[PDB]
Amino acid sequence: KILISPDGEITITNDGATILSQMELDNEIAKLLVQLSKSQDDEIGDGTTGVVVLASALLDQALELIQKGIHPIKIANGFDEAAKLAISKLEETCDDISASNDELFRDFLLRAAKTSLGSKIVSKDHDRFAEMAVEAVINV
Amino acid sequence: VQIFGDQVTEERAENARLSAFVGAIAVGDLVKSTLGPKGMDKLLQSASSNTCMVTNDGATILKSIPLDNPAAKVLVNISKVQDDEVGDGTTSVTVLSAELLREAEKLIDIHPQTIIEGYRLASAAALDALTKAAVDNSHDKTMFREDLIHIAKTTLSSKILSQDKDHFAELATNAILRLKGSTNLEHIQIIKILGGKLSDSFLDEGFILAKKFGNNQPKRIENAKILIANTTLDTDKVKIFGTKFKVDSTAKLAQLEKAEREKMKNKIAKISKFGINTFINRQLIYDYPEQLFTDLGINSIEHADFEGVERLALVTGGEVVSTFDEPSKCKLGECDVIEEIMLGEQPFLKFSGCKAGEACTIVLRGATDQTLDEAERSLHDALSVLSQTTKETRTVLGGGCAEMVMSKAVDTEAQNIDGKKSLAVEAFARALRQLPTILADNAGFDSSELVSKLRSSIYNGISTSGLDLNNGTIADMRQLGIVESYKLKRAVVSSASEAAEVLLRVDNIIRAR
Amino acid sequence: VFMNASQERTTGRQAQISNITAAKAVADVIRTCLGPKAMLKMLLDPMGGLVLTNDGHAILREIDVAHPAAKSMLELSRTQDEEVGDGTTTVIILAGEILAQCAPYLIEKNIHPVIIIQALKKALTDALEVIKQVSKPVDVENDAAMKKLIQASIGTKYVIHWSEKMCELALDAVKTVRKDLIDIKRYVRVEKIPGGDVLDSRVLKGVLLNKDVVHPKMSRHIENPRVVLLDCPLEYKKGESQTNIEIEKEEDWNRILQIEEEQVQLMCEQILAVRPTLVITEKGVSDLAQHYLLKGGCSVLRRVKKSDNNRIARVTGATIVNRVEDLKESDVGTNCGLFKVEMIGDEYFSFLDNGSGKACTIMLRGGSKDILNEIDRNLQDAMAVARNVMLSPSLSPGGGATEMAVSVKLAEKAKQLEGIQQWPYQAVADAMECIPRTLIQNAGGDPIRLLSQLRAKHAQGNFTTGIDGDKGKIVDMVSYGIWEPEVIKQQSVKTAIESACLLLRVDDIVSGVR
Amino acid sequence: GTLSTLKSKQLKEKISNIGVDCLGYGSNDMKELFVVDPFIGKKQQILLATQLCRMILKIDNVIISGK
Amino acid sequence: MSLQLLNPKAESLRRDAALKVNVTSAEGLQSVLETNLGPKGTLKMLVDGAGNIKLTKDGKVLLTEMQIQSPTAVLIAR
Amino acid sequence: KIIVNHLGKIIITNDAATMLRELDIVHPAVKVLVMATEQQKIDMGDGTNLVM
Amino acid sequence: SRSDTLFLGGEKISGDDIRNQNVLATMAVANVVKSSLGPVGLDKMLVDDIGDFTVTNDGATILSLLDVQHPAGKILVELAQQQDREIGDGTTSVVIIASELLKRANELVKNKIHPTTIITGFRVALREAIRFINEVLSTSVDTKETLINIAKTSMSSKIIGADSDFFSNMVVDALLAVKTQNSKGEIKYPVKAVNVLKAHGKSATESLLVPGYALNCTVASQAMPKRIAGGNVKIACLDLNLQKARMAMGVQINIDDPEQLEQIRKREAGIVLERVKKIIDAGAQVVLTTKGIDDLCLKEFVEAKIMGVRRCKKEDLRRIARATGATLVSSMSNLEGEETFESSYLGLCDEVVQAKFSDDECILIKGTSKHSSSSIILRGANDYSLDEMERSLHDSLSVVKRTLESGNVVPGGGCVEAALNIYLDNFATTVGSREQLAIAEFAAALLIIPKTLAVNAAKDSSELVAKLRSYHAASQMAKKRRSYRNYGLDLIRGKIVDEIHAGVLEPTISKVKSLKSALEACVAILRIDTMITVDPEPPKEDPH
Numbered sequence A: 001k002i003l004i005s006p007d008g009e010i011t012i013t014n015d016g017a018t019i020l021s022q023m024e025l026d027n028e029i030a031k032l033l034v035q036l037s038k039s040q041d042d043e044i045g046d047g048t049t050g051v052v053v054l055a056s057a058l059l060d061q062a063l064e065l066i067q068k069g070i071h072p073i074k075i076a077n078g079f080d081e082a083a084k085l086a087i088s089k090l091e092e093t094c095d096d097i098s099a100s101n102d103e104l105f106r107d108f109l110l111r112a113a114k115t116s117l118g119s120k121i122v123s124k125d126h127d128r129f130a131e132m133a134v135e136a137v138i139n140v
Numbered sequence B: 001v002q003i004f005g006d007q008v009t010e011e012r013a014e015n016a017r018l019s020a021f022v023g024a025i026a027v028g029d030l031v032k033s034t035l036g037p038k039g040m041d042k043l044l045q046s047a048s049s050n051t052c053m054v055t056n057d058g059a060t061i062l063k064s065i066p067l068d069n070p071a072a073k074v075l076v077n078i079s080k081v082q083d084d085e086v087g088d089g090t091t092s093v094t095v096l097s098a099e100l101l102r103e104a105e106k107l108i109d110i111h112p113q114t115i116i117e118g119y120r121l122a123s124a125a126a127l128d129a130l131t132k133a134a135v136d137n138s139h140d141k142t143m144f145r146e147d148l149i150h151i152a153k154t155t156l157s158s159k160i161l162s163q164d165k166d167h168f169a170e171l172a173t174n175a176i177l178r179l180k181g182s183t184n185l186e187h188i189q190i191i192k193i194l195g196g197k198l199s200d201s202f203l204d205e206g207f208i209l210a211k212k213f214g215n216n217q218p219k220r221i222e223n224a225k226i227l228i229a230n231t232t233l234d235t236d237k238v239k240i241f242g243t244k245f246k247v248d249s250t251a252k253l254a255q256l257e258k259a260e261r262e263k264m265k266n267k268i269a270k271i272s273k274f275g276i277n278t279f280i281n282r283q284l285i286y287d288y289p290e291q292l293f294t295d296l297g298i299n300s301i302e303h304a305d306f307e308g309v310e311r312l313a314l315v316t317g318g319e320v321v322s323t324f325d326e327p328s329k330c331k332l333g334e335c336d337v338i339e340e341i342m343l344g345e346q347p348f349l350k351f352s353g354c355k356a357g358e359a360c361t362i363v364l365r366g367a368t369d370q371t372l373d374e375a376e377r378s379l380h381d382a383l384s385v386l387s388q389t390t391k392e393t394r395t396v397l398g399g400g401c402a403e404m405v406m407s408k409a410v411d412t413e414a415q416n417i418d419g420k421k422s423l424a425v426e427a428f429a430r431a432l433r434q435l436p437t438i439l440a441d442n443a444g445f446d447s448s449e450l451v452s453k454l455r456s457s458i459y460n461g462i463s464t465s466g467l468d469l470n471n472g473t474i475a476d477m478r479q480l481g482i483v484e485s486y487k488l489k490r491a492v493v494s495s496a497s498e499a500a501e502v503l504l505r506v507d508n509i510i511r512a513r
Numbered sequence C: 001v002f003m004n005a006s007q008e009r010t011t012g013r014q015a016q017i018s019n020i021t022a023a024k025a026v027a028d029v030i031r032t033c034l035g036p037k038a039m040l041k042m043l044l045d046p047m048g049g050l051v052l053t054n055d056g057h058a059i060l061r062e063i064d065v066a067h068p069a070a071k072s073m074l075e076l077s078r079t080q081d082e083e084v085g086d087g088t089t090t091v092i093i094l095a096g097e098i099l100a101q102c103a104p105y106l107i108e109k110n111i112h113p114v115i116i117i118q119a120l121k122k123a124l125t126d127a128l129e130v131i132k133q134v135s136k137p138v139d140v141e142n143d144a145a146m147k148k149l150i151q152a153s154i155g156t157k158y159v160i161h162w163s164e165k166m167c168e169l170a171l172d173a174v175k176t177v178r179k180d181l182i183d184i185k186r187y188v189r190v191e192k193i194p195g196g197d198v199l200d201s202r203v204l205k206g207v208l209l210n211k212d213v214v215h216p217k218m219s220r221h222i223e224n225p226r227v228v229l230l231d232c233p234l235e236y237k238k239g240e241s242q243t244n245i246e247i248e249k250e251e252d253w254n255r256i257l258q259i260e261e262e263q264v265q266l267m268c269e270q271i272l273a274v275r276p277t278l279v280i281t282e283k284g285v286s287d288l289a290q291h292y293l294l295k296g297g298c299s300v301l302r303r304v305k306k307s308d309n310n311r312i313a314r315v316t317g318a319t320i321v322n323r324v325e326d327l328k329e330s331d332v333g334t335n336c337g338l339f340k341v342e343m344i345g346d347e348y349f350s351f352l353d354n355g356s357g358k359a360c361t362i363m364l365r366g367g368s369k370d371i372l373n374e375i376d377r378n379l380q381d382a383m384a385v386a387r388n389v390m391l392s393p394s395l396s397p398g399g400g401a402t403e404m405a406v407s408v409k410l411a412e413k414a415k416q417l418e419g420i421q422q423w424p425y426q427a428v429a430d431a432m433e434c435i436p437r438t439l440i441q442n443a444g445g446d447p448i449r450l451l452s453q454l455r456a457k458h459a460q461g462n463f464t465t466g467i468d469g470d471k472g473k474i475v476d477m478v479s480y481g482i483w484e485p486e487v488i489k490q491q492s493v494k495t496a497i498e499s500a501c502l503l504l505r506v507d508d509i510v511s512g513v514r
Numbered sequence D: 001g002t003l004s005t006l007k008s009k010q011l012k013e014k015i016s017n018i019g020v021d022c023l024g025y026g027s028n029d030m031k032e033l034f035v036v037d038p039f040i041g042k043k044q045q046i047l048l049a050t051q052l053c054r055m056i057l058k059i060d061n062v063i064i065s066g067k
Numbered sequence E: 001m002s003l004q005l006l007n008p009k010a011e012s013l014r015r016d017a018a019l020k021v022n023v024t025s026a027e028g029l030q031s032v033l034e035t036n037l038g039p040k041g042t043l044k045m046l047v048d049g050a051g052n053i054k055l056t057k058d059g060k061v062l063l064t065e066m067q068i069q070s071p072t073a074v075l076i077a078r
Numbered sequence F: 001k002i003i004v005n006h007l008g009k010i011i012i013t014n015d016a017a018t019m020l021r022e023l024d025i026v027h028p029a030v031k032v033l034v035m036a037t038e039q040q041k042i043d044m045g046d047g048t049n050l051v052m
Numbered sequence G: 001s002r003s004d005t006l007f008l009g010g011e012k013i014s015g016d017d018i019r020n021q022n023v024l025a026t027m028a029v030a031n032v033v034k035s036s037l038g039p040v041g042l043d044k045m046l047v048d049d050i051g052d053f054t055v056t057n058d059g060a061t062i063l064s065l066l067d068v069q070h071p072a073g074k075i076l077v078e079l080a081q082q083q084d085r086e087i088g089d090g091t092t093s094v095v096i097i098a099s100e101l102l103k104r105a106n107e108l109v110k111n112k113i114h115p116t117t118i119i120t121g122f123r124v125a126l127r128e129a130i131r132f133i134n135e136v137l138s139t140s141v142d143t144k145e146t147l148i149n150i151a152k153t154s155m156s157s158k159i160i161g162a163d164s165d166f167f168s169n170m171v172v173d174a175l176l177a178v179k180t181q182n183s184k185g186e187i188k189y190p191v192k193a194v195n196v197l198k199a200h201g202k203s204a205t206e207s208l209l210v211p212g213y214a215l216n217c218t219v220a221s222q223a224m225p226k227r228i229a230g231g232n233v234k235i236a237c238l239d240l241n242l243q244k245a246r247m248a249m250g251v252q253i254n255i256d257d258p259e260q261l262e263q264i265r266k267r268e269a270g271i272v273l274e275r276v277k278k279i280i281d282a283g284a285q286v287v288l289t290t291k292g293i294d295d296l297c298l299k300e301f302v303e304a305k306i307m308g309v310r311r312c313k314k315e316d317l318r319r320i321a322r323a324t325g326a327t328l329v330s331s332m333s334n335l336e337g338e339e340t341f342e343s344s345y346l347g348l349c350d351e352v353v354q355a356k357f358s359d360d361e362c363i364l365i366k367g368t369s370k371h372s373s374s375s376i377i378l379r380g381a382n383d384y385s386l387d388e389m390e391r392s393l394h395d396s397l398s399v400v401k402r403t404l405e406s407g408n409v410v411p412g413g414g415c416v417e418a419a420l421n422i423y424l425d426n427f428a429t430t431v432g433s434r435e436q437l438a439i440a441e442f443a444a445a446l447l448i449i450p451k452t453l454a455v456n457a458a459k460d461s462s463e464l465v466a467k468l469r470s471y472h473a474a475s476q477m478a479k480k481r482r483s484y485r486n487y488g489l490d491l492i493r494g495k496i497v498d499e500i501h502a503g504v505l506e507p508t509i510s511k512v513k514s515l516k517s518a519l520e521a522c523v524a525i526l527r528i529d530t531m532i533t534v535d536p537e538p539p540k541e542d543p544h
């Protein structure tokens, strides 16, 4: 998306955690949504966009819940329970069947960026970018 | 550029959906708190007349709201529509919609124009099953009256006047009885006066005209044989018109006597007709009641058009045309005629035993001058339900039974189609399922655990059931006498998933100022 | 100094391109509504227009376009509904798409409009032939040929879900007039009743109307009645010219009075001597006029809408007679099987059922005052496709089929005729895919795979093969009940292109002031 | 479409490798097609959206005034 | 911007706020007519936009002859 | 070339005697050669362009 | 509606409307300069909204004067000024290719193609396009003869086209003959070029090249010689600013008891002259400072008959000293202790004559130790032209440099852009399916240029381009040579003609850097579907 700054600068980017910040917002709660997107960046560094589309679905269905005589607070921790179960299920799915490699193997580290490099403006030029990043990190 | 000239706005796709789906529910949340006696009424103030209306009637509740949105004003039509065709439930005819399309909205995440196919085919299966569960009969006037009351009751409930529910349900079922099936509800006029208290609102077997007898005449009448005259008791003159010039000075010497005499033929023509009382469309000259009072003939100058006939169709005495052309054979067989003594002006009366029937369901309610209105429109909502059963013998149980049977039936089909169109079906049901749910919000019972509770019982029983608003047991509606007419609950269903169609097809719009 | 200050001029490629690409505007908006996955639009003109009709004309009328090369589309459409009912939307599509595909040559050129103009002028009349080759009246000839030609039309409208009803609804009324082998398309009457629903629309096999009253004691219904179409005022309407009654003598007034009374008294009795059951007039009688006739058991009529009463005589066979004193006994209408006053909505209609009668009046009910009208205009597009289905039993295999077939023809001819005339020939050819294009884009099924596979097949055969999204993929629209009357597809191309050249015949544009 | 077919492949192969690949224009295995993301990636996302919803859901009234 | 309608120049005093505006004025017409009952009570002088003077203790008089904009109030005035 | 009347009506022609018919000129000199074409279209049908 | 955020002044367009607004915004900046390119093309005049004009045919400079409103348009302006950096010429054309790439790309997603598919359809067609350049440019490594052709092709579609052949050499010769440097073992021609001036008035053709630099300056004092020629001249480029001298700041001067305020007053000036002489004593035929000489320090450089120039262009005294072997001195001190100056600092030229050019005069420096000095002094009617004549120069000098800094050249004139057109579509369409339709448009978008080269001529040219097709397609397909391909457009005279047979020739580099960047720009906008544009900072306008 293109972003015309209140200053004048132009921004075109796929980083939804930067895109959200750039697009002026009013509603104080909508603002909240921004920080939780900028969090995933300071924490992990990816999924800045996906986490937002999550904060939606949840809040969007907690909508459906309240609408059916389901208490908010009961939904709060009620959700948080499914949170700790999700962050735990993520291992029971990579223990396991798939992979958890950390070193001695670039076949994956690169492919992590290949997917990561992939789906951005640099999609076409990623080969050089993917490896480069991996190499520029794994060496530190 | 052109176009036709801005400023003109244009909304298309995603947002145009929300703004419409969310745009309707906006109306729906406010509208819903009007179901079951644990129901609310909203105030409605009009700019001009600077007077307010208080009552609960989905039709009026929205017909009295200035609303900018097309999608909202749209709903305001649905209401003002069912009110016309059916008469009751208008309050909810939108509720299942706003929910319905809110369902469609979520489902829209998936082509829309196909969703309409489901809601028109799947809610058709619902429309069908609801006919099956219907209970017809009986057709014995012995049994009818006992059903019509149960209908009038279930309808008259939740309305300010519920307090003496019976008192009104009786008012309704009576006026409906007179005039077989099916006759217009335009002959029985709901007149209202501001008179102390509530429940002093009786039904009248005659008419309650505004006018009060002229001069110092008797206020009562025995074996009333009234007369339906048209022409004013004044010296006549062609409509084309003509001028009379007194060419002869001696011509006036006879002209003067022609005056007093050319109207004395009114008196002679009255006594001769055996008539005892009279009343005329057009007004009568002061030179007339004078003669009337001494004779004892009663004077009732000027009567409205539709009132001229009410007094007529009450006694079937034919509307006389001009005085002295009236046959004693045509007369009003009125049982009595009196002047009720209300504060200030007092209306006259035309009581009838049959009668006749041209009912006048006059309602007082001094308590609040703006409650009569609030009430005499609920009596109506009764009337029009006590009639639909006559025209349509079919009836069905409420309390959430209506929706329960559908959502139940519809529910299975959705799990069978195992088609994308099929999910559509499932929502069509979950929209209905919403109505009872919402009906719980108001009574106070938890919704979620109340429908599931209610849906099991339909299975154990099927389809008789519902959710009790107040009386304990969560008892079946047929037991508690909570039922309304079947075709009404059809139009409601169809008529909603209709606007749900048109409104779900718009996609894009263009608005000017 | 001329020119006058000020009036805009576009000389050059400007108007040459800023008129085609400007016409494309309105032609870019409607290009979404067409076919099974339709996109109906809503619009609020000045005041609360609040109208939602998918009729391409009905749409292009509200845009009220001001641009010249655009008001051409709001015209190339307006015509459609004069010749052929439906198709109004699809014209503009091509009408513009043509203009569109004219840009490439015109821009990389160095090519005068005159060249492009005649270049299409040929291709057009070329396509007109192929069409006249396909229609075939009538292989499996049946009275259902019209019925299924309407299910091709009503299809994908605001009635499609409930259409099989509004199908037989249309056909019926159409076949009530002597247009078979000539008769107007007005006599069927479309009435608007407030509340109700699409499904609850009544197809009165006679007449329909409401009127003012003064006394209801009249009989509400009469079986096989006698109907007089009077057309008079009886109260006491003053004479045309300045009518006056100057008098002499004391005892004359009353004479004049009883005379006036007598004059009307007689007229009333005259009606009685006809033995009618319901007096229907186009003017006003109130008061005693009703009173008496009601005593006799006849529901008097307030003057009945002009076009209303003009239906009643034909249905009842009666003949409206403005004169009362010469009323013959063979001028009345009894054809009415059952005349009642069954109240509907907030109103009360007097329906004359029953037939041997021409005006099949339809009292269409609705759920929304903005929808009752969207259904009306949704049958005007039908009743006409029926009328034309009768006038010419020649049927075009529509559904983007006749288009994909014409294309192959034009594309065939163009190759042999190579040169600066090959491109413009392959123009209307390619641009003919305008329909099957968004016809599918609206739905969703991939269009490019569909036509790249539709052409690849239709080319080697399948002359009448369109895109039927009923099952996905595409097949011979000839087998399924997909039938579009001939006049539609034909006349449309000649028209859509008529402007697709006019807007190229344009050099510049000069304006004015207010 | 893909969702429904994912539900199956999910229940059948414990959603171990199955998912949606834009390239494949269908439903092949994420691992098979080398489509990989860090375990933290999607786990540290949920933990947020949830603890966030909590915050938002705790809100009952919004008033304004100079902080 | 939204609109959100509803309509401009219109307002929805809803729910408890409605409960307020409803109740919160009914007893408004209290402090006005409180004086009238009791032989020990006192009267009220009412003026108008036409420059006139009324000093009477009747309630229909001090309720009909008043200017009020809260439904309930006007309602009880009724 | 299209021309929009001072009343708003839309007009398209090839005829030059009509182009000017719908055209409001100011130049007293141009007025002449316009009066020409117009003072011909009435007397003789065609040939209005060879005039200008 | 909405609520979304945030208004007012902050808005956003979505999907279609943007993808359109973007394309319109591009064709805008594009279609303006779509007339310029091609010999048949013309120049334009831009008004400084204050009367002032500026005639130019350059696409880059022309787009700059436009103002570039909007992101999409300015994006092209940015892509333009990129081309000068790569090359120097073709700015007028590169914009077109890009614009056409979007125009078509969008016309595909308007056909529900989806951008991702397209953005690759170019990604590939581009690589293969260069793979075809490998067949065209290579044969153009061997073919001073073909250097004057490239410098001439950079004249057409320009003001100096009429005098092409004449200035074609003035261009070549200064760079080829007198403009070579060497940094870190690399040989290249001045990418910062060689001083070029403008002479108001005078003849068109008679623009005097110079066998030396043309420092634009006037003699300090009139008392100095106006010329010092002959041979072996003493040049001195001294950036010492030897004018006067004031106390070192922070070093205040408080005196007492004297009566010595004068004993150092002159001492302040003495130290100045002492340095002036120390330099004059090593040669001092001509002195060239950057800071400037003072009246009280000119008399000294005057009496010795030493030409002195007050405050010269620093960028000049460098280029000058580099050719005369001199050394642009910074500070007097050279190691410690030193005054200082050494005859080893002075330069080596032949003539230092101050010429005249219509109410104006500049000092020239003919001949040098290292024979690398060139300065072309143009001369025409008005500044309005004499400036634009320079634009054709700065834009033609470049085409040569880039050429002589890369052995590979390319048959321009619509030739290359024609071969690719046929070659990819006929031969690139192996993938087929949908990706094909993308590649296709990428090739079709290339015809855009050959097209406009023709449309520029009022005459019907729809056919002249059609021929260029069949011809070029002839190289391979369809249905030992002699290769019948490699021809091109002869805009001057209708019909095809072999371009290599003609002076026409564009540097391969130009045909690449422009083909490549034209894509990235296009892509970057393809990825766009929503443009949030937030309002700036408004004036306080506080009601309180």
Ligand SMILES: Nc1ncnc2c1ncn2[C@@H]1O[C@@H](COP(=O)(O)OP(=O)(O)O)[C@@H](O)[C@H]1O
Pocket: F014, F046, F047, F048, F049, F050, F051
């Ligand atoms: N082959 C042709 N047949 C008819 N007219 C032609 C032909 N070729 C050229 N023309 C031109 O068409 C006519 C003139 O165009 P027109 O707009 O009618 O001018 P005007 O109406 O003032 O005479 C001819 O007299 C001629 O100049």
Ligand SMILES: Nc1ncnc2c1ncn2[C@@H]1O[C@@H](COP(=O)(O)OP(=O)(O)O)[C@H](O)[C@H]1O
Pocket: B034, B035, B036, B037, B039, B056, B057, B058, B088, B089, B090, B091, B092, B154, B155, B157, B158, B159, B381, B398, B399, B400, B439, B466, B467, B468, B469, B482, B484
């Ligand atoms: N006694 C009841 N118990 C349970 N549900 C009831 C009862 N009475 C009515 N309902 C349901 O809720 C009603 C809501 O009132 P409605 O007729 O829609 O508009 P209004 O109450 O304003 O006239 C339904 O018509 C009905 O099915």
Ligand SMILES: Nc1ncnc2c1ncn2[C@@H]1O[C@@H](COP(=O)(O)OP(=O)(O)O)[C@H](O)[C@H]1O
Pocket: G036, G037, G038, G039, G057, G058, G089, G090, G091, G092, G093, G153, G154, G155, G156, G157, G158, G395, G412, G413, G414, G453, G489, G490, G491, G492, G504, G506
């Ligand atoms: N004589 C020619 N005939 C046809 N095309 C040419 C000719 N000379 C150059 N071209 C091509 O078209 C030109 C367009 O002019 P351009 O260089 O873009 O602007 P300018 O020459 O003013 O800097 C190219 O430089 C070139 O590849």
Ligand SMILES: Nc1ncnc2c1ncn2[C@@H]1O[C@H](COP(=O)(O)OP(=O)(O)O)[C@H](O)[C@@H]1O
Pocket: E036, E037, E038, E039, E059
């Ligand atoms: N002497 C008294 N002692 C105690 N109470 C009295 C006495 N006289 C009257 N009352 C009562 O006090 C009440 C208040 O007067 P009220 O009816 O309110 O006057 P109003 O209704 O016109 O305002 C009784 O209705 C009654 O009049």
Ligand code: BEF
Pocket: A014, A015, A016, A046, A047, A048, A049, A116, A119, A120
């Ligand atoms: F957000 Be993605 F990783 F660019």
Ligand code: BEF
Pocket: B056, B057, B058, B087, B088, B089, B090, B091, B155, B378, B381, B382
């Ligand atoms: F539906 Be109720 F009568 F308002």
Ligand code: BEF
Pocket: F014, F015, F016, F045, F046, F047, F048, F049, F050
């Ligand atoms: F038609 Be011509 F020009 F008069």
Ligand code: BEF
Pocket: G057, G058, G059, G060, G088, G089, G090, G091, G092, G093, G395
């Ligand atoms: F293309 Be040139 F440099 F203007």
